[PDB]
């Protein structure tokens, strides 16, 4: 399934990656998608690649990670590139400016990115208005039917007691989200990763699940009209975890996820422990991309064992090829998120990655994608 539209953007891609600033590249991409002039991938997806996380049914196992469309101003176009879902955010109750620019740097040779954004977003209220507009468009557009939209949530920079910010987001945007991702792993908000302590993380998770469950109580109508999302059901609850933890921490947090019955785990966020990128020596922030590939996959194996395979995994980190996706899936992941791939490969990310994984699934001997989960 070629397309003359995907190719023209590869021409622009080589230019931008070589001269234009990363965040400027991001703004242009988002701006083009805002006006619905990005290519489409309206082909039927392989039934062998369909996946699910409990009652969440994904048409294919590739979405866009958080931090890409932080404000939900580009949902329709990005999804129509060929992705099955998108994770908007991370959002905070009040929009922030973030750290000072430049805050995004690219090492083309190593296919790596380092960023110190600091949760720059428009705020929960405005992003909610955008998401409502999208759900209205989704009702009238076939290319958006059955596509998923998750919302990554966090805290404002100054707001102490992160629980309060989360409850506000839940109570304003919860009705329109298919799943909620708790971000306690961003390295650009000081001390957020200190909240991954078993006790703290327990109260955070339990408060989110309770707040989601409480929106349903005082409702006047049926559930079909309350949940204006894809599932027509209350959003699942996922947690996004950082890879820079020791084994003791890793096992107890996994124990907390079992006790609290979390719906999923997103492995993983960016890392701060990489020191082998010469261009990023004097740069602050977390690094993403290829140099994060092998590190995150291990973490998935370490966690897929710590939770006794009872909590599904969502893979994110250094996924650039179809074989990378299968490496993540056979390690224990059910779905994959692409971020740096879109940065370095552009519009062809979804169509390319989905084809490559399809060919590899049958060669390795599988009836469908599920058969591969944790087979390693
Ligand atoms: C510029 C930039 C901004 C990001 N913003 C967020 C964010 O707001 N929330 C979040 O959970 N992750 C954020 N991330 C992390 C990505 O979502 C993803 O977990 C990570 O980059 C690994 O993806 P990759 O290896 O395929 O590039 C951001 C990453 C980058 C590079
Ligand atoms: C999507 C994306 C994001 N970001 C930062 C947040 C991390 C980058 O730095 C990027 N660099 N490229 C090259 C992209 C992707 C891209 C492709 C095509 C164009 C266009 F053809 F329109 F010119 C523009 C941009 C980036
Ligand atoms: O989770 C996150 C958040 C940010 C940010 O918005 O600053 N950046 C990342 O690399 N990861």
Q: Which two tokens stand for residue 314?
A: 């969502």
Q: Which two tokens stand for residue 315?
A: 């893979």
**Which H, E and C letters describe 11-69, residue by residue?**
HHHHHHHHHCCHHHHHHHHHHHHHCCCCCCCCCCCCCCCCEEECCEEECCCEEECCCCC
Q: Report DSSP state, residue 335.
A: E
Q: Which two tokens stand for residue 142?
A: 């076939």
Q: CB neighbours of 140 closer than 8 A, spacing ≥ 6?
A: none
Answer yes or no: are the C-beta atoms of 138 and 147 closer than 8 Å. Answer: yes
Residue closest via CA to ligand 1's atom 22 equals: 317
Instruction: Say which residue the tokens 């890879």 belong to.
Output: 243
Answer yes or no: are the C-beta atoms of 282 and 331 closer than 8 Å. Answer: no
Rounded to the nearest 5°, which phi and psi values hold at 336?
-135, 145
What is the rounded CA–CA span in Å between residue 7 and residue 30? 18
What is the rounded CA–CA span in Å between residue 212 and residue 4? 44
What is the rounded CA–CA span in Å between residue 270 and residue 186? 7
Answer yes or no: are the C-beta atoms of 365 and 319 closer than 8 Å. Answer: no
Answer yes or no: are the C-beta atoms of 183 and 153 closer than 8 Å. Answer: yes
Q: Which two tokens stand for residue 187?
A: 């390295």
What is the rounded CA–CA span in Å between residue 184 and residue 323? 29
Q: Report the 10 Å Cβ neighbour count for 362.
A: 11
51 φψ region: left (φ > 0), alpha (ψ -120 to 50), beta (else): beta
Residue closest via CA to ligand 2's atom 14 equals: 343
Q: CB neighbours of 157 closer than 8 A, spacing ≥ 6?
A: 96, 118, 119, 189
Residues with C-beta less than 6 Å from any ligand 2 atom = 9, 12-13, 16-17, 22-23, 25-26, 28-29, 32, 104, 106, 113, 342-343, 346
Q: CB neighbours of 70 closer than 8 A, spacing ≥ 6?
A: 88, 89, 90, 91, 120, 121, 122, 127
Residue closest via CA to ligand 3's atom 1 equals: 186
- This entry's atomic model was obtained through X-ray
- Cα–chain-centroid distance for residue 184? 13
Question: In the chain, what are the domains?
Answer: 3-376 (3.20.20.70)
Query: Is 98 a known ligand-binding residue?
Result: no
The closest alpha carbon to 162, from 87, 93, 210, belongs to 93
By the 10 Å C-beta count (0-12 exposed, 13-18 middle, 19+ buried), 33 is classed as buried
Ligand showing the shortest atom-to-Cα distance for residue 348? 2
Answer yes or no: are the C-beta atoms of 220 and 163 closer than 8 Å. Answer: no
H or E stretch covering 237: strand 236-241
Ligand showing the shortest atom-to-Cα distance for residue 70? 1
Cross-strand bridge partners of residue 182: 153, 239
What is the rounded CA–CA span in Å between residue 228 and residue 230? 7
Instruction: Say which residue the tokens 């000081």 belong to.
Output: 190
**Which H, E and C letters describe 17-33, residue by residue?**
HHHCCHHHHHHHHHHHH
Q: How many residues does the chain have?
A: 376
Q: Which two tokens stand for residue 109?
A: 């040779």
Q: Which two tokens stand for residue 39?
A: 């290519």
Query: What are the Cα distances from residue 352, in Å, to 42, 47, 219, 275?
Result: 14, 17, 44, 31
Cross-strand bridge partners of residue 267: 241, 315
End-to-end alpha-carbon separation of the chain, Å?
31
> Is 110 a known active-site residue?
no
Q: Which two tokens stand for residue 182?
A: 């708790």
Q: Which two tokens stand for residue 344?
A: 């370095």
What is the rounded CA–CA span in Å between residue 376 and residue 21? 40
Rounded to the nearest 5°, which phi and psi values hold at 61?
-95, 30
The closest alpha carbon to 286, from 158, 152, 157, 99, belongs to 99
By the 10 Å C-beta count (0-12 exposed, 13-18 middle, 19+ buried), 123 is classed as middle
Q: Give the number of C-alpha atoms closer than 13 A to the C-alpha of residue 132, restricted to the C-beta side.
A: 11
């Amino acid at each position: 399934s070629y397309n003359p539209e995907f190719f023209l953007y590869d021409i622009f891609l080589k230019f931008c990656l070589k001269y234009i600033d990363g965040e400027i590249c991001h703004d242009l991409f988002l701006l083009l998608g805002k006006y619905n002039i990005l290519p489409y991938d309206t082909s039927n997806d392989s039934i062998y690649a369909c996946t699910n996380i409990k009652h969440l049914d994904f048409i294919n196992p590739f979405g866009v990670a958080a931090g890409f469309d932080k404000n939900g101003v580009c949902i329709d176009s990005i999804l129509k590139l060929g992705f099955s879902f998108i994770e908007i955010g991370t959002i905070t109750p009040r929009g922030q400016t973030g750290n000072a620019k430049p805050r995004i740097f690219r090492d083309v040779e190593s296919r790596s990115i380092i960023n110190s954004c600091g949760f720059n977003n428009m705020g929960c209220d405005k992003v909610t208005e955008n998401l409502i507009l999208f759900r209205k468009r989704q009702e009238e557009d076939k290319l958006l039917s059955k596509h998923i939209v998750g919302v990554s949530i966090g805290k404002n920079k100054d707001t102490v007691n992160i629980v309060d910010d989360l409850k506000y987001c839940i109570n304003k945007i919860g009705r329109y989200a298919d799943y909620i991702a708790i971000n306690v792993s961003s390295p650009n908000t000081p001390g957020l990763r200190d909240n991954q302590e078993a006790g703290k993380l327990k109260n955070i998770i339990l408060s989110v699940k309770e707040e989601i469950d409480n929106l349903e109580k005082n409702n006047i109508m049926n559930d079909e009209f309350l949940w204006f999302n894809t599932t027509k059901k209350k959003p699942l609850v996922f947690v996004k975890l950082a890879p820079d933890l020791n084994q003791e921490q890793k096992k107890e947090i996994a124990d907390v996820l079992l006790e609290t019955n979390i719906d999923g785990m997103i492995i993983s966020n960016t890392t701060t422990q990489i020191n082998d990128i010469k261009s990023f020596e004097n740069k602050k922030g977390g690094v993403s991309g290829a140099k994060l590939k092998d590190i995150s996959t291990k973490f998935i194996c370490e966690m897929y064992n710590y939770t006794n395979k009872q909590i599904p995994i969502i893979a994110s980190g250094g996924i650039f090829s179809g074989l990378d996706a299968l490496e993540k899936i056979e390690a224990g992941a059910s779905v994959c998120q692409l971020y740096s791939c879109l940065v370095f490969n552009g519009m062809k990310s979804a169509v390319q990655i989905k084809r490559e994984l399809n060919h590899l699934l049958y060669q390795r001997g599988y009836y469908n994608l599920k058969e591969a989960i944790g087979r390693k």
